[PDB]
JSON list of C-alpha atoms in Angstrom, two decimals:
[
{"chain": "A", "resi": 6, "resn": "UNK", "atom": "CA", "xyz": [-103.03, 33.01, -48.92]},
{"chain": "A", "resi": 7, "resn": "UNK", "atom": "CA", "xyz": [-100.95, 35.88, -50.00]},
{"chain": "A", "resi": 8, "resn": "UNK", "atom": "CA", "xyz": [-103.87, 38.31, -51.16]},
{"chain": "A", "resi": 9, "resn": "UNK", "atom": "CA", "xyz": [-105.27, 38.75, -47.79]},
{"chain": "A", "resi": 10, "resn": "UNK", "atom": "CA", "xyz": [-101.71, 39.08, -45.90]},
{"chain": "A", "resi": 11, "resn": "UNK", "atom": "CA", "xyz": [-101.35, 42.23, -48.22]},
{"chain": "A", "resi": 12, "resn": "UNK", "atom": "CA", "xyz": [-104.64, 43.58, -47.20]},
{"chain": "A", "resi": 13, "resn": "UNK", "atom": "CA", "xyz": [-104.68, 43.30, -43.57]},
{"chain": "A", "resi": 14, "resn": "UNK", "atom": "CA", "xyz": [-101.49, 45.24, -43.78]},
{"chain": "A", "resi": 15, "resn": "UNK", "atom": "CA", "xyz": [-103.52, 47.87, -44.98]},
{"chain": "A", "resi": 16, "resn": "UNK", "atom": "CA", "xyz": [-106.73, 47.46, -43.85]},
{"chain": "A", "resi": 17, "resn": "UNK", "atom": "CA", "xyz": [-105.58, 47.39, -39.95]},
{"chain": "A", "resi": 18, "resn": "UNK", "atom": "CA", "xyz": [-103.12, 49.47, -40.12]},
{"chain": "A", "resi": 19, "resn": "UNK", "atom": "CA", "xyz": [-104.32, 53.39, -39.94]},
{"chain": "A", "resi": 20, "resn": "UNK", "atom": "CA", "xyz": [-105.86, 55.42, -37.54]},
{"chain": "A", "resi": 21, "resn": "UNK", "atom": "CA", "xyz": [-105.73, 58.98, -38.26]},
{"chain": "A", "resi": 22, "resn": "UNK", "atom": "CA", "xyz": [-107.31, 59.61, -41.58]},
{"chain": "A", "resi": 23, "resn": "UNK", "atom": "CA", "xyz": [-105.14, 61.39, -44.44]},
{"chain": "A", "resi": 24, "resn": "UNK", "atom": "CA", "xyz": [-101.74, 59.73, -42.48]},
{"chain": "A", "resi": 25, "resn": "UNK", "atom": "CA", "xyz": [-100.25, 60.06, -44.93]},
{"chain": "A", "resi": 26, "resn": "UNK", "atom": "CA", "xyz": [-99.64, 63.60, -44.77]},
{"chain": "A", "resi": 27, "resn": "UNK", "atom": "CA", "xyz": [-98.71, 63.08, -41.67]},
{"chain": "A", "resi": 28, "resn": "UNK", "atom": "CA", "xyz": [-96.61, 60.92, -43.88]},
{"chain": "A", "resi": 29, "resn": "UNK", "atom": "CA", "xyz": [-94.85, 63.55, -45.43]},
{"chain": "A", "resi": 30, "resn": "UNK", "atom": "CA", "xyz": [-94.76, 65.79, -42.39]},
{"chain": "A", "resi": 31, "resn": "UNK", "atom": "CA", "xyz": [-92.13, 63.78, -41.15]},
{"chain": "A", "resi": 32, "resn": "UNK", "atom": "CA", "xyz": [-90.63, 62.45, -45.11]},
{"chain": "A", "resi": 33, "resn": "UNK", "atom": "CA", "xyz": [-90.05, 66.88, -45.64]},
{"chain": "A", "resi": 34, "resn": "UNK", "atom": "CA", "xyz": [-88.97, 68.02, -42.19]},
{"chain": "A", "resi": 35, "resn": "UNK", "atom": "CA", "xyz": [-86.28, 65.64, -41.54]},
{"chain": "A", "resi": 36, "resn": "UNK", "atom": "CA", "xyz": [-85.09, 65.79, -45.70]},
{"chain": "A", "resi": 37, "resn": "UNK", "atom": "CA", "xyz": [-84.75, 69.67, -44.41]},
{"chain": "A", "resi": 38, "resn": "UNK", "atom": "CA", "xyz": [-84.71, 70.38, -40.98]},
{"chain": "A", "resi": 39, "resn": "UNK", "atom": "CA", "xyz": [-87.95, 71.14, -39.02]},
{"chain": "A", "resi": 40, "resn": "UNK", "atom": "CA", "xyz": [-89.85, 72.62, -41.80]},
{"chain": "A", "resi": 41, "resn": "UNK", "atom": "CA", "xyz": [-91.96, 75.48, -40.14]},
{"chain": "A", "resi": 42, "resn": "UNK", "atom": "CA", "xyz": [-95.33, 75.62, -41.27]},
{"chain": "A", "resi": 43, "resn": "UNK", "atom": "CA", "xyz": [-96.01, 71.96, -41.19]},
{"chain": "A", "resi": 44, "resn": "UNK", "atom": "CA", "xyz": [-98.75, 71.63, -38.35]},
{"chain": "A", "resi": 45, "resn": "UNK", "atom": "CA", "xyz": [-101.63, 74.74, -39.54]},
{"chain": "A", "resi": 46, "resn": "UNK", "atom": "CA", "xyz": [-104.67, 73.88, -39.53]},
{"chain": "A", "resi": 47, "resn": "UNK", "atom": "CA", "xyz": [-106.21, 76.76, -41.92]},
{"chain": "A", "resi": 48, "resn": "UNK", "atom": "CA", "xyz": [-105.06, 77.40, -45.20]},
{"chain": "A", "resi": 49, "resn": "UNK", "atom": "CA", "xyz": [-103.55, 80.95, -45.94]},
{"chain": "B", "resi": 98, "resn": "UNK", "atom": "CA", "xyz": [-62.81, 113.98, -26.03]},
{"chain": "B", "resi": 99, "resn": "UNK", "atom": "CA", "xyz": [-59.22, 115.50, -26.20]},
{"chain": "B", "resi": 100, "resn": "UNK", "atom": "CA", "xyz": [-59.12, 118.78, -24.50]},
{"chain": "B", "resi": 101, "resn": "UNK", "atom": "CA", "xyz": [-57.56, 121.79, -24.90]},
{"chain": "B", "resi": 102, "resn": "UNK", "atom": "CA", "xyz": [-58.00, 125.14, -24.16]},
{"chain": "B", "resi": 103, "resn": "UNK", "atom": "CA", "xyz": [-54.95, 128.41, -23.58]},
{"chain": "B", "resi": 104, "resn": "UNK", "atom": "CA", "xyz": [-55.35, 132.38, -24.43]},
{"chain": "B", "resi": 105, "resn": "UNK", "atom": "CA", "xyz": [-55.26, 135.72, -22.72]},
{"chain": "B", "resi": 106, "resn": "UNK", "atom": "CA", "xyz": [-59.55, 136.16, -23.06]},
{"chain": "B", "resi": 107, "resn": "UNK", "atom": "CA", "xyz": [-59.92, 133.02, -25.77]},
{"chain": "B", "resi": 108, "resn": "UNK", "atom": "CA", "xyz": [-62.69, 131.70, -24.09]},
{"chain": "B", "resi": 109, "resn": "UNK", "atom": "CA", "xyz": [-61.49, 127.72, -23.01]},
{"chain": "B", "resi": 110, "resn": "UNK", "atom": "CA", "xyz": [-64.28, 125.38, -23.82]},
{"chain": "B", "resi": 111, "resn": "UNK", "atom": "CA", "xyz": [-65.14, 122.37, -21.03]},
{"chain": "B", "resi": 112, "resn": "UNK", "atom": "CA", "xyz": [-64.67, 118.68, -21.17]},
{"chain": "B", "resi": 113, "resn": "UNK", "atom": "CA", "xyz": [-67.20, 116.87, -23.50]},
{"chain": "B", "resi": 114, "resn": "UNK", "atom": "CA", "xyz": [-68.98, 114.08, -22.11]},
{"chain": "B", "resi": 115, "resn": "UNK", "atom": "CA", "xyz": [-69.43, 112.15, -25.97]},
{"chain": "B", "resi": 116, "resn": "UNK", "atom": "CA", "xyz": [-71.49, 108.07, -25.41]},
{"chain": "B", "resi": 117, "resn": "UNK", "atom": "CA", "xyz": [-73.06, 108.08, -29.27]},
{"chain": "B", "resi": 118, "resn": "UNK", "atom": "CA", "xyz": [-76.09, 104.81, -29.34]},
{"chain": "B", "resi": 119, "resn": "UNK", "atom": "CA", "xyz": [-75.55, 103.74, -32.74]},
{"chain": "B", "resi": 120, "resn": "UNK", "atom": "CA", "xyz": [-78.15, 101.25, -33.49]},
{"chain": "B", "resi": 121, "resn": "UNK", "atom": "CA", "xyz": [-78.45, 98.13, -36.33]},
{"chain": "B", "resi": 122, "resn": "UNK", "atom": "CA", "xyz": [-80.48, 97.27, -39.13]},
{"chain": "B", "resi": 123, "resn": "UNK", "atom": "CA", "xyz": [-82.85, 93.76, -39.26]},
{"chain": "B", "resi": 124, "resn": "UNK", "atom": "CA", "xyz": [-82.74, 93.16, -43.90]},
{"chain": "B", "resi": 125, "resn": "UNK", "atom": "CA", "xyz": [-84.13, 88.69, -44.04]},
{"chain": "B", "resi": 126, "resn": "UNK", "atom": "CA", "xyz": [-84.78, 87.92, -47.22]},
{"chain": "B", "resi": 127, "resn": "UNK", "atom": "CA", "xyz": [-86.45, 84.65, -48.92]},
{"chain": "B", "resi": 128, "resn": "UNK", "atom": "CA", "xyz": [-85.75, 82.65, -52.02]},
{"chain": "B", "resi": 129, "resn": "UNK", "atom": "CA", "xyz": [-89.06, 81.04, -52.52]},
{"chain": "B", "resi": 130, "resn": "UNK", "atom": "CA", "xyz": [-88.20, 76.67, -53.29]},
{"chain": "B", "resi": 131, "resn": "UNK", "atom": "CA", "xyz": [-90.39, 74.77, -55.87]},
{"chain": "B", "resi": 132, "resn": "UNK", "atom": "CA", "xyz": [-91.15, 71.26, -55.06]},
{"chain": "B", "resi": 133, "resn": "UNK", "atom": "CA", "xyz": [-93.92, 69.08, -56.83]},
{"chain": "B", "resi": 134, "resn": "UNK", "atom": "CA", "xyz": [-97.16, 67.40, -55.51]},
{"chain": "B", "resi": 135, "resn": "UNK", "atom": "CA", "xyz": [-95.95, 64.30, -58.61]},
{"chain": "B", "resi": 136, "resn": "UNK", "atom": "CA", "xyz": [-92.02, 64.89, -57.77]},
{"chain": "B", "resi": 137, "resn": "UNK", "atom": "CA", "xyz": [-93.32, 64.41, -53.60]},
{"chain": "B", "resi": 138, "resn": "UNK", "atom": "CA", "xyz": [-95.07, 61.07, -55.17]},
{"chain": "B", "resi": 139, "resn": "UNK", "atom": "CA", "xyz": [-92.87, 58.25, -55.58]},
{"chain": "B", "resi": 140, "resn": "UNK", "atom": "CA", "xyz": [-91.34, 58.51, -52.37]},
{"chain": "B", "resi": 141, "resn": "UNK", "atom": "CA", "xyz": [-94.35, 58.50, -50.86]},
{"chain": "B", "resi": 142, "resn": "UNK", "atom": "CA", "xyz": [-96.65, 55.93, -52.93]},
{"chain": "B", "resi": 143, "resn": "UNK", "atom": "CA", "xyz": [-94.06, 53.21, -53.18]},
{"chain": "B", "resi": 144, "resn": "UNK", "atom": "CA", "xyz": [-94.64, 51.72, -57.02]},
{"chain": "B", "resi": 145, "resn": "UNK", "atom": "CA", "xyz": [-93.66, 48.38, -58.70]}
]
């Protein structure tokens, strides 16, 4: 019973595709004070 | 201006207005700084 309760936390949270990547953008700019260049649909 | 003139026939240079605008100069610097994805992986994958 504990198995699928670790599962259905994972398989029911994500609404954004690479949800970890936006969490990387949060967990850098909080450590580093609003880093520029976070939001880019482009590749430089 | 420090004004002075004199003389009997010595020509008297008139008073002087001096305004000088002197600009500043920019020099934007940059040091690069590297953090690896393997460094950022351990905070953000939460192993056992």
